[PDB]
């Protein structure tokens, strides 16, 4: 896998974000994560606030496509996204603001990494795990 540059256009919520990728606006859906929905579930706005701060505060944003299908049925890019080298997908799981989702069409490269972050958040009874 490889990281590609991107520019934040607009935070949207916990599991999606609008980025300028290769000169064109595109909305991305974070791979392997399920956050609380606010459009308003418990820890829904928390999760949104979290990724919002992460994207807006970063100097560098990178998108990393996995090895499976690159876009879902709704035209959203499916990737692991990084803010200054830190993976937003993992950060959410680790903060207990999202659960690990089932693998989607072969995109499972970071499944174990996220599974561990999640086990740790659960152990700490963090947020969603309260």
Task: Give the catalytic positions in this structure.
Answer: 29, 37, 76
Would you say how long the chain is, in residues?
130
The vertex-83 CA angle with 57 and 79, nearest 5°, equals: 135
Q: CA 129, CA 84: separation in Å to the nearest integer?
A: 27
Tell whether residue 72 is among the known ligand binding residues.
Answer: no
Tell whether residue 7 is among the known ligand binding residues.
Answer: no
- The per-type count for the chain, helices as H runs and strands as E runs, is 3, 8
> Please, are residues 111 and 103 in contact by the beta-carbon 8 Å criterion?
yes
Tokens of 6: 């991107």
Tell whether residue 66 is among the known ligand binding residues.
Answer: no
3-state helix, strand, coil in the chain (%, to 5): 30, 35, 40
Residue positions in the annotated binding site? 15, 34-35
Residue positions in the annotated binding site for Ca(2+)? 15, 34-35
């Amino acid at each position: 896998l490889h990281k590609e540059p991107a520019t934040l256009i607009k935070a949207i919520d916990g599991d999606t974000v609008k980025l300028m990728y290769k000169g064109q606006p595109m909305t991305f859906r974070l791979l392997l994560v399920d956050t609380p929905e606010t459009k308003v579930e418990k820890y829904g706005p928390e999760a949104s606030a979290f990724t919002k701060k992460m994207y807006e505060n970063a100097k560098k944003i990178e998108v990393e496509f996995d090895k499976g299908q690159r876009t879902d049925k709704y035209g959203r890019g499916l990737a692991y996204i990084y803010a200054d080298g830190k993976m937003v997908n993992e950060a959410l799981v680790r903060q207990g603001l999202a659960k690990v989702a089932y693998v989607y069409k072969g995109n499972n490269t970071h499944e174990q990494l996220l599974r561990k972050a999640e086990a740790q958040a659960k152990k700490e009874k963090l947020n969603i795990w309260s």
